[model samples]
Target: MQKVLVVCMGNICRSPTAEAVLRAKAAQLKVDVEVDSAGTIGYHQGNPPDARSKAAGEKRGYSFSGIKARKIRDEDFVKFDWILAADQENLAELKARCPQSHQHKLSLMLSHSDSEYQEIPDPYYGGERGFELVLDLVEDAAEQFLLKL
Candidate 1:
């Protein structure tokens, strides 16, 4: 099966949010593909998305269930068809660590956005509106990314 791994710093906000948006879009489009999210770090490991993120996504008809913080495992480079990073920093980190053989799998999530937002801003420090903004970008990325698949 085709697979995807959305990525960010802690996996609490951006990455998981994008993951939900992608899954929701996939279901709506009736396509079969594996989608998941992870962090470059493990600080929030075993945790659900931030309450604000869940609220924003759920309000937009997306589900955040089964979403949790996980550091990218070595096997992930070979396992997923796509490894989408939320920003350049995380994308750089992923590139630095990803094996040359799998380097081709990495890309910016917003590369799939219609507007092609360069990066997904960290919304943890911002208020509810910040989380809402994430959904906005993710919604676009997911829709565009789905078309590619």
Candidate 2:
């Protein structure tokens, strides 16, 4: 099975949402893949996904349950087949922190979508609309990502 990791700053918002989106998309496509998410920072580690993120996903018929925020560990570099960063900053951070042996697995999450390389904006401090926007981007990217794989 191919393992994919979604990454963001906090993991509680964007990354968890993206992980759900990817998992749902893969299920719909009848594909078997392991999906997970992590944060570059450990501030929200062990917390459930943000409430707004869960709401956004639930509204789309996607469950965001059983996902707890976690920090990116060095072991993840060797464990996951792909590491998708939610934005440019996170992508850079992942690259900087990841071992050289795993550098080829790192990519920007938006690269899988049709948005012309747009960034998946952080929604932690934003309103409900921000969470909705994140779901939109994540769904688009997850769909495309499954196809590419």
Candidate 3:
């Protein structure tokens, strides 16, 4: 099975959204993949995903159940084959934390998609449209990522 870990700043918005959509898409494509999400820091550790993220994803039939916020653990680098980040900063954080042997696993989530934007914009402080856009981008990226598995 392919192991993928999605990440964002606070784990409330982008990462969880990516995790849910990627897991659902992987199932649809009949790929054997394990998906999870986390943050670079523990700011929202133990909290559920942002309401706006769940709301937007649910409208498209994605499930956020059982996905609580957590900080990126040391083992994550050794465990996941793909360490995808929601933005450049998160990728940098992962790179700094990841061991030299695992550095190749770090990359931007959107790197798998053909989308023009390389980073998934943060939606925590924005309106509903922000969350919707995240879903749009993540869904596209998820399918692309699964195809490789």
Candidate 4:
């Protein structure tokens, strides 16, 4: 099966949104893929996804169920065929921790789409528009990423 991991600094925001978009699209395409999300750090590991993210996604029919925050694990590098980061900084963090053998799997999520920004902004401090923008940015990446799969 094709496996992809969505990553960000905090799993509560962008990563979870990207993961949901990809999972929903994968199901619609009838593709057999394992999708998951995590953060570079364990800051919010056991917490549910941020409320704003869910609000924005649900309006567009995306569900945020069963996705809790978690830290990136050592096995993730070798386990997932694609490790997509929300931005360059998270990509750098993952790259630094990733073994050389698995370096090829790492990438910026927006690179899969024609997004103008390479990074998905952190919406924790911003308003609803920030969360909405994340869904907008990630949905495109998810669709394009599915086609490649």
Candidate 5:
């Protein structure tokens, strides 16, 4: 099975949402891929994803079970098939911390999708609409990523 880790600065929003979307898309396409999510920082460790994220995704039939905030670990670099980041900064952070041999496993999540946007914008500071937009982008990206499997 292919293991994928979606990441963001904080685990409370984008990455967790992406995790749900990715799993739902994979199931829809009947792809058997392992999906997980993490953050560059563990500020919210043990906490569930932002309530706004869950609210947005649950409305769309995605499940956010067994997920909580956790910082990316060194073992992740060698363990996952892919370590996709929500945006450039997180990707850069992963790149800087990851060993050179495992660098190829890291990439921007959007890069795997057909979306015009290059990054999955953070919706935390924004309004409710931002959460919906995140689901939209994540849905598209997750579908595209699963297609490659």
Candidate 6:
């Protein structure tokens, strides 16, 4: 199975939502793939995904279940086939921290999207609408991404 890791500043919001969205899409397509998410920072490590993210995903019939926030670890470089960063900063951070042997697997998540935006925005500090916008972006990207894989 192909393994993909979605990454963002904090695993609670964007990354987790991406993971759930992609997982749901893959299930719909009947594809066998493993999806996960991580954060560049460990600030929310061990916490469940943000409530706003969960609500947004739930509204779409996608469950953010069994998902928890985690910091990117060196081991992840070897464990995952693809390391998808949510934004430029997270992409840079993942590249800097990933093992040199695994650097090739790292890429920007939005790079797989049909959209022109290169970065997935952080909604932690934004209003409720921001979360919905993020879900919109993530869902579009995830669908495009799944088709590509």
Candidate closest to the true structure, highest TM-score: 3
Give every collision pair in model 1.
none
Between the candidate structures 2 and 6, which one is better when assessed by TM-score?
2
In order of appearance, the predictions have TM-scores of 0.96, 0.97, 0.98, 0.97, 0.97, 0.96
Best by lDDT: 4
Cα lDDT tens digits for candidate 5, 1-149: 78999999999999999898888888888888899999999899999999989988899888788999999999999999889999999999999999999998999998987779989999999999899989988888888889977
Residue ranges of candidate 4 with Cα displaced over 4 Å: none
As a whole number from 0 to 100, the lDDT of residue 98 in candidate 4 is: 98
Off by over 4 Å in 1: none
lDDT of 3 by residue, 1-149 (tens): 78999999999999999999988888889999999999999989999999889988999888899999999999999999999999999999999999999999999999888889899999988898899899989988988888866
Q: Is candidate 3 or candidate 4 better by TM-score?
A: 3
- Report every candidate's CA lDDT: 0.90, 0.91, 0.92, 0.92, 0.91, 0.90
What is the clash count for each candidate, in the order shown? 0, 0, 0, 0, 0, 0
Put down candidate 1 lDDT per residue, 1-149, tens digits, no spaces: 57999999999999999888888888889888889999999999999999989988889777888887899889899999999999999999999999999999999999976774779899999888788889888888888898877
- The residue pairs found clashing in candidate 4 are none
Model 2 Cα displacement at 20 (Å)?
0.8
Please give the TM-score that candidate 6 achieves against the real structure.
0.96
How big is the positional error of residue 20 in model 1, measured in Å on the Cα after superposition? 1.1
Task: Give the least accurate 10-residue stretch of model 4, judged by summed lDDT.
Answer: 112-121
Task: Give lDDT tens digits, candidate 4, residues 60-132.
Answer: 9999999999999999999999999998999999999999999999999989887677888889999888988
lDDT of 6 by residue, 1-117 (tens): 799999999899999999999998999988889999999999999999999889877988989889988988888999999889998999999889888889999999888987988
Per-residue alpha-carbon lDDT of model 2 for 32-130, expressed as tens digits? 999999999999989999987898799889898889999999999999999999999999999998999899999998887777656899988889888
